[PDB]
Curated annotation (Swiss-Prot), chain A:
Keywords assigned: Acetylation, Mitochondrion, Ribonucleoprotein, Ribosomal protein
Localisation: Mitochondrion
Organism: Homo sapiens (Human)
One Pfam family it belongs to: MRP-S33
Primary location: mitochondrion
Protein name per UniProt: Small ribosomal subunit protein mS33
Highest taxon above the source species: Eukaryota
Gene expressing this chain: MRPS33
GO molecular function: structural constituent of ribosome
From Swiss-Prot, chain D:
Protein family membership: Belongs to the universal ribosomal protein uS9 family.
Location of this fragment in the whole protein: 67 to 132 of 396
Compartmental location: Mitochondrion
Protein name: Small ribosomal subunit protein uS9m
Domain of life, source organism: Eukaryota
Lineage of source species: Eukaryota, Metazoa, Chordata, Craniata, Vertebrata
Subunit field text: Component of the mitochondrial small ribosomal subunit (mt-SSU). Mature mammalian 55S mitochondrial ribosomes consist of a small (28S) and a large (39S) subunit. The 28S small subunit contains a 12S ribosomal RNA (12S mt-rRNA) and 30 different proteins. The 39S large subunit contains a 16S rRNA (16S mt-rRNA), a copy of mitochondrial valine transfer RNA (mt-tRNA(Val)), which plays an integral structural role, and 52 different proteins.
From Swiss-Prot, chain F:
Subcellular location: Mitochondrion
GO biological process entries: mitochondrial translation
Similarity section: Belongs to the universal ribosomal protein uS10 family.
Chain's gene name: MRPS10
Subunit structure: Component of the mitochondrial small ribosomal subunit (mt-SSU). Mature mammalian 55S mitochondrial ribosomes consist of a small (28S) and a large (39S) subunit. The 28S small subunit contains a 12S ribosomal RNA (12S mt-rRNA) and 30 different proteins. The 39S large subunit contains a 16S rRNA (16S mt-rRNA), a copy of mitochondrial valine transfer RNA (mt-tRNA(Val)), which plays an integral structural role, and 52 different proteins.
GO CC annotation, single: mitochondrion
Name of the protein in its database record: Small ribosomal subunit protein uS10m
Keywords: Mitochondrion, Ribonucleoprotein, Ribosomal protein
Domain of life: Eukaryota
UniProtKB/Swiss-Prot annotation, chain G:
Subunit comment: Component of the mitochondrial small ribosomal subunit (mt-SSU). Mature mammalian 55S mitochondrial ribosomes consist of a small (28S) and a large (39S) subunit. The 28S small subunit contains a 12S ribosomal RNA (12S mt-rRNA) and 30 different proteins. The 39S large subunit contains a 16S rRNA (16S mt-rRNA), a copy of mitochondrial valine transfer RNA (mt-tRNA(Val)), which plays an integral structural role, and 52 different proteins.
Keyword field contains Ribosomal protein: yes
Localisation per UniProt entry: Mitochondrion
GO molecular function, one term: RNA binding
GO cellular component labels: mitochondrial inner membrane; mitochondrial small ribosomal subunit; mitochondrion
Superkingdom, taxonomy of origin: Eukaryota
Protein name, as recorded: Small ribosomal subunit protein uS3m
Keyword flag Mitochondrion: yes
Family: Belongs to the universal ribosomal protein uS3 family.
One Gene Ontology biological process: mitochondrial translation
Keyword list, A-Z: Mitochondrion, Ribonucleoprotein, Ribosomal protein, Transit peptide
Originating organism: Homo sapiens (Human)
Amino acid sequence: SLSEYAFRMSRLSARLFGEVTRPTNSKSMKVVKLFSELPLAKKKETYDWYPNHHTYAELMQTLRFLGLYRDEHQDFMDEQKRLKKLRGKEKPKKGEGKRA
Amino acid sequence: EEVVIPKKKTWDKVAVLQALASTVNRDTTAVPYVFQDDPYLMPASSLESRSFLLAKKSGENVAKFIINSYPKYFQKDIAEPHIPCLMPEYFEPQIKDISEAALKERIELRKVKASVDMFDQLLQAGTTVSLETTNSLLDLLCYYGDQEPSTDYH
Amino acid sequence: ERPPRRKALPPRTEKMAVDQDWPSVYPVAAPFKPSAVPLPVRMGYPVKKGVPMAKEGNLELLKIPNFLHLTPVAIKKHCEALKDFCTEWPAALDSDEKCEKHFPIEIDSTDYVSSGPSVRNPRARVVVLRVKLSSLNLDDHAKKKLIKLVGERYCKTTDVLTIKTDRCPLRRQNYDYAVYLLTVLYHESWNTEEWEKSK
Amino acid sequence: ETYTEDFIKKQIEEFNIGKRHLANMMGEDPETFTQEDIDRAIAYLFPSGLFEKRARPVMKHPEQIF
Amino acid sequence: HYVDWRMWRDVKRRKMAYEYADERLRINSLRKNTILPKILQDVADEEIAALPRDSCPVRIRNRCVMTSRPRGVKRRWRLSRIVFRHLADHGQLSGIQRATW
Amino acid sequence: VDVPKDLTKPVVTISDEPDILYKRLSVLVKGHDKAVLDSYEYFAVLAAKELGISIKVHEPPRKIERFTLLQSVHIYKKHRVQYEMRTLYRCLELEHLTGSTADVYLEYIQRNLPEGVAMEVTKTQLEQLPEHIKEPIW
Amino acid sequence: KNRAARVRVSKGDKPVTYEEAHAPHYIAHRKGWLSLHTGNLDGEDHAAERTVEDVFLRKFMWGTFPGCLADQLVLKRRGNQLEICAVVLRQLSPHKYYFLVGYSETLLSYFYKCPVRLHLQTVPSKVVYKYL
Amino acid sequence: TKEAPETDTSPSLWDVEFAKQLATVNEQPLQNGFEELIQWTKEGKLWEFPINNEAGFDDDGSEFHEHIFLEKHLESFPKQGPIRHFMELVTCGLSKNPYLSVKQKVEHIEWFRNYFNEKKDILKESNIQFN
Ligand SMILES: [Mg+2]
Ligand SMILES: [Mg+2]
């Protein structure tokens, strides 16, 4: 639904501005969209979604063993685990458990 | 008609900060800026002045000791532009091959004992050590008197 | 204990003269320090038959981004030292009409200042180039061909061609591209193709 | 909390000295600095957006506060 | 040291998907057009299907980074509604207040 | 009495390259607190007046983003908690600046940007026609 | 009944600070925010990473200065700088405070790759706003 | 003085250490807030103002034409036919991508060249000649 003049002017402008020049259907235009953006898996929001829980936990465990960080929570579960040994509720040996 | 554009003015990245600093003078009511500006924490004597700074420096040394002891925990770089000075330091030789090129590393790291031992091993193997490399080893050995430079902790 | 517990010294606002050089106390942006600010400022919603809380240990005053380092006295002293860095605007360019005659092209760029460890902002790369087609040496054919090539980039009411570029990573690359697009548009508009006779 | 008369007198002395410091900070005449100038200075130096004005930083005469 | 095994499985999926993203994009482009021969597009269909299952981006779940809650998460803060409210109601999120109008 | 005798002024070197000409700078500042934007405006306008810069200030309309969350940890769907983030604006419009003047003013006011305030600086630069566009080559 | 961040009435013997006495519907009315950054402004990025950092810093300072903190932290971000303002008590010796300030500023600067300052303000005892 | 010093020759340990002693005589503690900001700026810790969002990022010193004009890289591919049309769509998308470096964009194109070289036999069956 375009005149030859209008069609040829649109093709010249598309070449000037770096757009698709050959006639391309909407299905094949997805190839252009695929390579003009980063894949969702490659975006920093995606692969850096979580904080590095290994670093935070391990750093603060090392700082506790060094005497520079007081972990009130870990102190709480160390006292509970200590009172369970005196009560006899100790974790069994792996493999050599109650069942066999 | 012609319009005359003024010539550009160029200054260092710290020039504006230095211009603003010139406008202010020392505050006589305050202790030196290095100290915490708090009546309980301000040094109240010449001795506390020295000891309070030594305590702060000790804290910084302890932090640096941890950073270099556990580089893994401080390797996530989120700074843009990158800040090289805020990264962990690696003081150990990473070239394990016995060669003259690998020896140069130990001299750059100032490992007097490692370098001397490796130089001896290199000489026993019979490989050639350049005069410049030998001179660099002598510079390291002569300057420090064949004694290890002080380190944070072993 | 050999002595008693360390006693806090009196606040140093008691040593401050009422005609001091205040900019020397707060040279740069710093948190509100009750012992350094000689003002009986109070803050906090008062309890019944009560008064707003005093400044010592007042966390509400600590939460404010204060302007104690930017008193009118300091700002005037600061700007006197910064006059050496400034250059003089060309006196000829009195009005906007005069600016357009001598400098037809306008380049818009944006810088974004946020707080955080990274300065990067993907919006800073965009460059916008504006030029009125009346400032370009375009004949009748060239002007008509240009308006058809650019499309909605041209505004008939203002007669302004707006070229926005954001293809390249950097702003300098998008600026070089914007200038290049204007160049090829100008030269192509002047070129006459044989198929143009089918209009 | 009870405010004895001696305490109020010490608070008035503090307000007068602070009032002179505030005029010195803003580069104005200590002798013609009014309460409406104090409020304007406090608003600039300690900008608070809290919707309730009674929670904002205030520097008033002790007679009006206590 | 992740909140639970479920979060740990999502961490591995995000890592594997990142490693394979370029290869998946390249193969998928071969399939998402009518230009190339169908014989070639059929071989690409098999190749992308042979990649490890955990490289598929649709398998990633936006879990709360603090508690691992798989639903009720606000994407801007990556926090569950419960954790977000706990931080917001204590005044620890800059500029977030209770809305009344 | 203990006053510095002489002061080393920072070296500002006049270059042989011509300076940039900015027709306009649009300093849009965003914040959650209106009083903090009032103080920043007073500071920014005073700094502009002392440096000889023409400045005009207006307040673009505020943006209030609201969203809803569940009241309870479990069930009770009818009960919600509604939060919002208010973004207030102030726009400083500078005019007829050179590259050096803008560099100094922007460094000064950007370094003193109060915590919780963002800035977007739109710079309109005056340029001359490219050399290649003076006449057609065909 | 609502529960969120409400210190409930006791016998009139529980001392509460000014922050702990105000429920969440006062956060922009009578009390301010304990953190000020640009993440949550319209059109601004990285609100999520700022939030995680704030949560870590409040935990770090609680355990690094055990029993010293007299109220909640005030976190300030200006450009590249991070400033932690803490109201502490006057029980720990000054030497130990200076050590911990030098240690925390260095360790946190290397962890978050930015200049970090710690501004301590000491109080003789916890500031009581009211007795609930 | 000496007309030309041995700048190319690296400093010995003695020269380096002596230069460290000359930086200590002039070493004093920070005197105010401005001086701390100046030190941080010199070390690279504090951002340099006015803020430049591209500070420290020059994508390999690439030019605008290396990102936008990518047909030089399609010279090994068939000049006509489906593979040409397809690769023209790939390069058009790549030319519109501000998130990839030139190196990354050329890697995409290089992958397709090898892929179509692996699939020559399949392509011949469908009336396509690759290389
Ligand atoms: Mg899903
Ligand atoms: Mg209800």
